[PDB]
């Protein structure tokens, strides 16, 4: 695309915030900034690293339902996002956030960028970087804590080449998985038999 900025409309104002937007869009490229707009309820501007990332986000996220609303994702005519008059969202978090230095961006080198799955939303999220003996029940209890729908089923892949786990989280619908992605991505999981917590990674 001609610009690294996109606009997202049809967000749920009570549910969404900058981190939760990042948690969805980071699947498709580096996210630099998210800005909610007082005058356009349900809309946010998102600056990605480049127009290739914008295009991937549009092609994969445009027209998807989340919290009863159709999300629309489209190119912005702005070349960049600037902090405006920042305000507190419904959840008490700030309307503007810069993620350019985030450890959780996944496309920071060309080599790293190429390893990311680029898939359309479906009713399954893949997870990785979970604790070594993570269980279905562990994910159930995290979803309860977050106030999001439990997956109907959790698969933990048996094969493990590091002290971490990967697998699948399944819901009955696309929209349930997408709604959950924004809340659950980058959750800090407690690590029993291990000294540091694990940052849960989700993707389609």
Residues contributing to the site for Cl ion (CB under 5 A)? 65, 68, 117-118, 175, 189-190, 198-199
Cβ-based nearer residue to Cl ion, 18 or 134: 134
Minimum distance, C-beta of residue 159 to Cl ion, in the bound complex (Å):
20
Cβ-based nearer residue to Cl ion, 76 or 175: 175
Cβ-based nearer residue to Cl ion, 68 or 88: 68
Q: Give the residue from 4, 11, 21 showing the smallest Cα distance to 75.
A: 4
Minimum distance, C-beta of residue 130 to Cl ion, in the bound complex (Å):
9
Give the chain as a 3 state SS string: CCCCEEEEECCCCCCCCHHHHHHHHCCCCCEEEEEECCCCCCCEEEEECCHHHHHHHHHHHCCCEECCEECEEEECCCCCCCCCCCCECCCCCECEEECCCCCCCCCCCHHHHHCCCCCCCCCEEEEEEECCCCCHHHHHHHHHHHCCCCCCEEEECCCCCCCCEEEEEECCCHHHHHHHHHHHCCCEECCCCCCCCEECEEEC
Cβ-based nearer residue to Cl ion, 4 or 121: 121
Cβ-based nearer residue to Cl ion, 5 or 134: 134
Minimum distance, C-beta of residue 193 to Cl ion, in the bound complex (Å):
13
Minimum distance, C-beta of residue 117 to Cl ion, in the bound complex (Å):
4
Minimum distance, C-beta of residue 74 to Cl ion, in the bound complex (Å):
20
């Amino acid at each position: 695309a001609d610009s690294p900025v996109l606009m997202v409309y049809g967000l749920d104002q009570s549910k969404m915030n900058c981190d939760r937007v990042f948690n969805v869009f980071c699947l498709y490229g580096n996210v630099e900034k998210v800005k909610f707009m007082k005058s356009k309820p349900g809309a946010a501007m998102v600056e990605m690293a480049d127009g290739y990332a914008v295009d991937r986000a549009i092609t994969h996220l445009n027209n998807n339902f989340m919290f009863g609303q159709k999300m629309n994702v489209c190119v912005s005519k702005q070349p960049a996002i600037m902090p405006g008059q920042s305000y507190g969202l419904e959840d008490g978090s700030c309307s503007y956030k810069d993620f350019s230095e985030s450890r959780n961006n996944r496309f920071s080198t060309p080599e790293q960028a190429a390893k990311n799955r680029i898939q359309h939303p479906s009713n399954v999220l893949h997870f990785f970087n979970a604790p070594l003996e993570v269980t279905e029940e562990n994910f159930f209890e995290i979803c309860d804590e977050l106030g999001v729908k439990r997956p109907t089923s959790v698969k933990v892949f048996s094969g493990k080449s590091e002290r971490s786990s990967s697998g699948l989280l399944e819901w009955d619908s696309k929209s349930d998985a997408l709604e959950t992605l924004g809340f659950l991505n980058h959750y800090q999981m407690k690590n029993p038999n291990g000294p540091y917590p694990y940052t849960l990674k989700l993707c389609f």
